[PDB]
Ligand binder design. Structure first.
Ligand SMILES: CC(=O)N[C@H]1[C@H](O[C@@H]2[C@H](O[C@]3(C(=O)O)C[C@H](O)[C@@H](NC(C)=O)[C@H]([C@H](O)[C@H](O)CO)O3)[C@@H](O)[C@H](O[C@H]3[C@H](O)[C@@H](O)[C@H](O)O[C@@H]3CO)O[C@@H]2CO)O[C@H](CO)[C@H](O)[C@@H]1O[C@@H]1O[C@H](CO)[C@H](O)[C@H](O)[C@H]1O
Ligand SMILES: CC(=O)N[C@H]1[C@H](O[C@@H]2[C@H](O[C@]3(C(=O)O)C[C@H](O)[C@@H](NC(C)=O)[C@H]([C@H](O)[C@H](O)CO)O3)[C@@H](O)[C@H](O[C@H]3[C@H](O)[C@@H](O)[C@H](O)O[C@@H]3CO)O[C@@H]2CO)O[C@H](CO)[C@H](O)[C@@H]1O[C@@H]1O[C@H](CO)[C@H](O)[C@H](O)[C@H]1O
Ligand SMILES: CC(=O)N[C@H]1[C@H](O[C@@H]2[C@H](O[C@]3(C(=O)O)C[C@H](O)[C@@H](NC(C)=O)[C@H]([C@H](O)[C@H](O)CO)O3)[C@@H](O)[C@H](O[C@H]3[C@H](O)[C@@H](O)[C@H](O)O[C@@H]3CO)O[C@@H]2CO)O[C@H](CO)[C@H](O)[C@@H]1O[C@@H]1O[C@H](CO)[C@H](O)[C@H](O)[C@H]1O
Lengths: 103, 103, 103, 103, 103
């Protein structure tokens, strides 16, 4: 079991860490069929999604996907600094696997 | 997968984007049977709903409808600026498909 | 579909609109068996309930009853102005069907 | 149906009202097995629990127990004044049945 | 039934109390499959997890694990002082069993 987001990210293929150390610039969410997702951006233009739940996800991830969208929304609204994102780089927009917040 | 609300909106028939760049003026929600819905307005009078769930919705959208009502309520209470709404034109009030929020 | 709380209220028998234009004065909730309910009051003493779920509710209302209690608690805690309540007047305390919030 | 917490409390055996008119001093919660519970204290030392869900509860209470723990956490974090608690006094710590909050 | 986190923690093997009396320094959350977890740190470098749900957990603990991640997120965002953690010491990072907040 990892102790931080960088080591967690390294337990997966097709992932990378992005260091933001910034608040979220915009928060988008959709209830439209087959596009039940969230998208965040940063002022540097960087865009990330929480993927639509699908075949790629194991059952244990379903609650965690919902939690992540909850986390992004409240981080956005409270202007919380996002430290790092672990993302999958075989999706466009890059898909969030993990988030760290500090400072 | 789309990277922003405008492109997402364009993936659906008979939708449009409204640009508000304003906080929500009023928030209404109902538990009354067959009217389990939310209604928001802006100061210009513009009125939008989250639809009552029905057969027009696929299963994957049901959780997202609930999340959207959560989002609208907290956006209202925090006076968060709503950037755009993607809506369906064939409902009255216009039915929300997606929301974006930015400073 | 209605566009505001007043029109929604009028789609039901046994209802009335209360215009409060005030924050909630007190919030009460109970987990006691057969009394799993919330009660709110306003400054003038006027009292309203979210009813115990029961056979007078259809299945689609169960989630909306839980949402309404969520709404009333956060409205109370944030001192959000309640504009109107739509209530059923064939219950004591008057039973909330819908709420609108506006400053 | 009762109009207030005092009248509600009187509908049950083994209960009493505590009039606190104070914020919560401490909030404790546990996920440990068979001790999935919350405990609050007040500055006067008074201590209360939300009981572990069990055989003493009917199914309609399960969602209300979870809601109560949510309420106590947010009341704690926002320093909301608790007016009264209705508690079962045949338990140690005294077990919360209902809460009222007023400025 | 215990009356405080210290006595609760002593009902379990392989647990200990850490006294922090500090806000959470960082909050990390993951939706990655098999690492659906949260990690917190304190400025003294201490690191704790909420374990991935699994067979070491009885069914009643699953809702309480979700609640705990909710609690840690909002405690982080509000800079709430954590008084004590009860943690299992047979896990790395040490795994949270209970939390207390005061002052
Ligand atoms: C890389 C990949 O295809 N991942 C998909 C995963 O495949 C499993 C194994 O991949 C890892 C991984 O995702 O990196 C390997 C990591 O070590 C694992 N880490 C931990 C901490 O457990 C993760 C983790 O278990 C899963 O992610 C949890 O769901 O899995 C992959 O190496 C393995 O490959 C097999 C191959 O399939 C087989 O034919 C060949 O003979 O042997 C290879 C091993 O040498 O296959 C594993 C599945 O059996 O599978 C999951 C579903 O279980 C997803 O499909 C995952 O795809 C990504 O999913 C992401 C969201 O969760 C996101 O959408 C990404 O864009 C997807 O690529
Ligand atoms: C009035 C009443 O007893 N309502 C109960 C309802 O009864 C149904 C019809 O009532 C309405 C209503 O609630 O006003 C009629 C509205 O037009 C409907 N509006 C919409 C937008 O759909 C609603 C709505 O469909 C339901 O509320 C959704 O569950 O229903 C009622 O008129 C009808 O009885 C007529 C009868 O047909 C007629 O021959 C005779 O002359 O008079 C009767 C009384 O007007 O019966 C319908 C049911 O078959 O039924 C629901 C559940 O099925 C509830 O029991 C409802 O009671 C209210 O419930 C509220 C909570 O949802 C709240 O607790 C109130 O205090 C209850 O009275
Ligand atoms: C007193 C007691 O042991 N209560 C347990 C309950 O027993 C039922 C009757 O209790 C009441 C009550 O809890 O006060 C009586 C009230 O009038 C009811 N009020 C309303 C508004 O309905 C409540 C309510 O129905 C239940 O609480 C909902 O679940 O129930 C109890 O009096 C009765 O036993 C009588 C017996 O009938 C009589 O012949 C003899 O002379 O005296 C007995 C004791 O007074 O038994 C009823 C059930 O058959 O049952 C529930 C079931 O889930 C609980 O076990 C309840 O225990 C309390 O539970 C609380 C949490 O819900 C909390 O943990 C308290 O500490 C428990 O004591």
């Amino acid at each position: 079991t990892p102790q931080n987001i960088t080591d967690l990210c390294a337990e997966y293929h097709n992932t990378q860490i992005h260091t933001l150390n910034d608040k979220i610039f915009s928060y988008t969410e959709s209830l439209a069929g087959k596009r039940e997702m969230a998208i965040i951006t940063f002022k540097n233009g960087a865009t990330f999604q929480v993927e639509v739940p699908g075949s790629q996800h194991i059952d244990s991830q379903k609650k965690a996907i919902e939690r992540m969208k909850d986390t992004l929304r409240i981080a956005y609204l409270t202007e919380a600094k996002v430290e790092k994102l672990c993302v999958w780089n075989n999706k466009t927009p890059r898909a969030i696997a993990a988030i760290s917040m500090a400072n």
